[PDB]
Structures are given as C-alpha cells and as structure tokens.
C-alpha cells in the first residue's frame, strides 16, 4: 500500500517470468481458476 | 450404514524426524495440514576418541 490503496496489478515479464520450476506446494491441490505456462513455436523442430 | 469407524486417541510423537515443509505457521490442524512433509534427522555418532 504505497498510495494506501496501491498494489497495481503486476504481471509477468515478457521474457523469463513464467518459471518452469514452480507449482503447487502440497501433495493435494486446489485447482486454481487460471494458470499459465510456456511453449515453443512451430519454427523450432521438436525434440524429446 | 456400510462402514464402522472407531474413535480413539494416542499420545503419538516423532522422536527422530523433523518437518521438511509446513503449509502455514499455525497449528490446530486444518484441511491444508493434510499435506505436510517430514524428513529424517541427521545421524550422530558420539563415542570415545
């Protein structure tokens, strides 16, 4: 609360912010409403 | 009814295992506390030189 009502919505950075190394921190889940992920473009050939 | 459970209480504890992960700082078990985690404690080898 910098302006006593602050917290303007901080979003993900374009480049790196979605971290492939996070997730639910308990064996069970809550099945959050909205989720984000990373994926390539078809230009890069697919490899295992 | 097709199930009969039995309600009992014991003075259980943990003598050699610490908690790897805890959901929240509060005790008084809630639903989230269903999924905590624990890790065994390091070995110790006291003896004579």
Automatic annotation (TrEMBL), chain A:
Top-rank lineage group of the source organism: Viruses
Subcellular location(s) per record: Host nucleus; Virion
Induction of expression: Expressed in the late phase of the viral replicative cycle.
Stated role: Major capsid protein that self-associates to form 240 hexon trimers, each in the shape of a hexagon, building most of the pseudo T=25 capsid. Assembled into trimeric units with the help of the chaperone shutoff protein. Transported by pre-protein VI to the nucleus where it associates with other structural proteins to form an empty capsid. Might be involved, through its interaction with host dyneins, in the intracellular microtubule-dependent transport of incoming viral capsid to the nucleus.
Similarity comment: Belongs to the adenoviridae hexon protein family.
Subunit structure: Homotrimer. Interacts with the capsid vertex protein; this interaction binds the peripentonal hexons to the neighboring penton base. Interacts with the hexon-linking protein; this interaction tethers the hexons surrounding the penton to those situated in the central plate of the facet. Interacts with the hexon-interlacing protein; this interaction lashes the hexons together. Interacts with host dyneins DYNC1LI1 and DYNC1I2; this interaction might be involved in intracellular microtubule-dependent transport of incoming viral capsid.
Other comments on record: All late proteins expressed from the major late promoter are produced by alternative splicing and alternative polyadenylation of the same gene giving rise to non-overlapping ORFs. A leader sequence is present in the N-terminus of all these mRNAs and is recognized by the viral shutoff protein to provide expression although conventional translation via ribosome scanning from the cap has been shut off in the host cell.
Protein name per UniProt: Hexon protein
């Amino acid at each position: 609360a910098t302006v006593a009502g602050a917290g303007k919505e901080i979003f993900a950075d374009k480049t790196f912010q979605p971290e492939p190394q996070v997730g639910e921190s308990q064996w069970n889940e809550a099945d959050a409403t909205a989720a984000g992920g990373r994926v390539l473009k078809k230009t890069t050939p697919m490899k295992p | 009814p097709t199930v009969v459970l039995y309600s009992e209480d014991v003075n259980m504890e943990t003598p050699d295992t610490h908690l790897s992960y805890k959901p929240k700082m509060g005790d008084k078990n809630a639903k989230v506390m269903l999924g905590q985690q624990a890790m065994p404690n390091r070995p110790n080898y006291i003896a004579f030189r």
